[PDB]
Design a protein around this ligand. Structure first.
Ligand SMILES: NC(=O)c1ccc[n+]([C@@H]2O[C@H](COP(=O)([O-])OP(=O)(O)OC[C@H]3O[C@@H](n4cnc5c(N)ncnc54)[C@H](OP(=O)(O)O)[C@@H]3O)[C@@H](O)[C@H]2O)c1
Lengths: 358, 358
């Protein structure tokens, strides 16, 4: 069965990738596209300075970009993805929720809101239960389906937590966590980055440190709001860097378990290679069976040689070994195809589709 | 005016030694050694000049010699070594036994209990072990005994440079992380590194972890051997990466003090600003009096923006801020001219000469 999909901020970078993906999806129909006044009225192909290495089909190319209001075609969408600029996403997404619509957003605005799930779909799909219970209890009493928002974490946060989930399931809570990122370009000018390193990405470290606590966190007794891992319970230290690499974020991570003793390296590696995410078990269309590709070569993963090879995995993980300060260190290569805003967004909608929320 | 030898003169480290010595009035380039397939040839005909700056042509005409203590090598007041580790142990041993003063970049003798491992802007006082030994041999036999001082690689020197003043002021550091983003400056081809990250430098993390504890360690009661900091009292975790950058290693670092409670972030910044290395206080020519350059901009240091401008400091240090796991984190940029093998070696020779060990 085909659900109708809308895209807010459709002309932007993340918006482009949303439409590109949904275009190949057998379960979704691109029904409404939204951007600013500068774009409204134009065919998508004229509204968007297309920056993807892949071209878009003609039928999607001719679709007329609409204003970002819960109106006409947007009121007809079963799910509304959002890559809106944060300057406008606040007001707009709220009115979409108010109109009773299902919003899956990459905007940072509502990420830290207490009743809003912050979801890396290959890691914490269970955090969606909060909206699931709200929705299903509302409709069972005969009332109108409330409308809600689920937020998509960034590629960097998603890369950090991805290997952590199986490890936390098997060996219990992680109380200490470091990450130094080596982040790719995919604005950053050639002037800024060529033969250079910028040891600062604005807001990225606070994002990384705070979001991971919510994603790996829990819910309050009333089951309506999220209770992120408190600071006394888990320390997270991020250092983010831009590097002269076109595609694929690398993270050099360190971790310690709260429960003693630490497992063995082989148990850790075996845990990571064996993990199947909840979304795969639900039978979701865009979910990877295995979310992690464990690599044994001592110089792997590398962004350039493992980008395509492992594009079916959430992350590639290499150099898993015992640490000198915490328990283990390892190297993580994110894959945009799976854990990128667009890929994460579609999977959330599939999870919503299964479980009958949309 | 001291006469200088260079072993493994044709290699990357040898080239840097020769170049830097030619710009130095206190030294005379007196002997050059390399492989037997180089021996008997002018230096320009023996070497593939991989440097940016060209050599004065009078230096180019120097005939390279076999790596043996035999002719011009026997008259050198200091012999610098840039031999590969698979032959260096044999040759450097011969030189020491011939009575010569060896300053080596090779790894072979670094872990020896009696051999100083020196980052001369950090632990020049470790040379006192050699000094007292030479003092002992003069009283006993009349002649100098022959010795090795080992030079730490640029990566270790970068880590330890800002730590020295901190430890002097606030006491020992019991925990320390580093993720490095290391410049090209086996080799490393463009094919490996361009538009890519290589999360592995062979032996690098091991050296970084072990050598730190010795460099920041002490001397036994008799002043005859080195007592590196016990593993339990300083946990050091390194994660080394190669990036597409020509010159200037970046290190993303975290540290915690053993002495509780921690100083403030303001105390730390000013401690680094006020540090003047002891080699500068001795009057050594190559030692930077402003050893550390702290930068206040949120996006600095950057290798390409700061490598020429800060080429006369040991390190530039930026983004000094409170940490959430350990006490503080910060971004460190190394300056090869000062703390690289050649620059470090010349400074050691300057200290040796000032202290009459020659
Ligand atoms: N070279 C140029 O002239 C130029 C132009 C655009 C972008 N860029 C660069 O490329 C990047 C791509 O942009 P982005 O996706 O990061 O962010 P963005 O374009 O500013 O915003 C993302 C999406 O939000 C929409 N939007 C913005 N303001 C809106 C409003 N007031 N009401 C409703 N929708 C609104 C945009 O549609 P609209 O397309 O209608 O604005 C776009 O689809 C930018 O960060 C920028 O650096 C350069």
């Amino acid at each position: 069965s085909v659900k109708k999909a809308g895209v807010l901020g459709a002309t932007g970078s993340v918006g482009q990738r949303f439409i590109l993906l949904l275009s190949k999806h057998p379960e979704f129909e691109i029904h409404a596209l939204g951007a600013s006044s500068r774009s409204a009225g134009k065919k998508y192909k004229d509204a968007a300075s297309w920056k993807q290495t892949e071209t878009l089909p003609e039928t999607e190319q001719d679709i007329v970009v609409q204003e970002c209001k819960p109106e006409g075609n947007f009121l007809e969408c079963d799910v509304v993805f959002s890559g809106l600029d944060a300057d406008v996403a606040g007001d707009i997404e709220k009115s979409f929720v108010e109109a009773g619509l299902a919003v899956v957003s990459n905007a940072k605005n509502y990420r830290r809101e207490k009743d809003v799930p912050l979801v890396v779909p290959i890691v914490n799909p269970e955090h969606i239960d909060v909206v699931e219970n709200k929705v299903k209890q509302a409709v069972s009493k005969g009332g109108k389906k409330p409308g809600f928002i689920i937020c998509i974490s960034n590629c960097s946060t998603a890369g950090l937590v991805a290997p952590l989930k199986p490890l936390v399931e098997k060996f219990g809570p992680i109380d200490a966590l470091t990450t130094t990122t080596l982040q790719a370009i995919s604005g950053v000018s050639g002037m800024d980055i060529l033969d250079n390193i910028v040891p600062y990405i604005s807001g990225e470290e606070d994002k990384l440190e705070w979001e991971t606590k919510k994603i790996l966190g829990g819910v309050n007794a009333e089951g309506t709001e999220f209770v992120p891992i408190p600071e006394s319970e888990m320390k997270v230290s991020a250092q983010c860097n831009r590097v002269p690499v076109i595609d694929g974020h690398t993270e050099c991570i360190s971790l310690r378990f709260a429960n003693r003793p630490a497992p063995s390296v082989e148990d850790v590696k075996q845990c990571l290679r064996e993990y199947e995410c909840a979304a795969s078990k639900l039978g979701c269309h865009s979910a990877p069976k295995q979310t992690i590709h464990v690599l044994d070569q001592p110089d792997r993963p590398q962004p350039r040689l493992d980008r395509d090879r492992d594009s079916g995995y959430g992350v590639s993980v290499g150099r898993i070994r015992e640490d000198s300060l915490l328990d283990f260190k390892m190297v993580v290569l994110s894959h945009n195809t799976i854990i990128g805003a667009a890929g994460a967004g579609i999977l959330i909608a599939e999870i919503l589709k299964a479980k009958n929320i949309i």
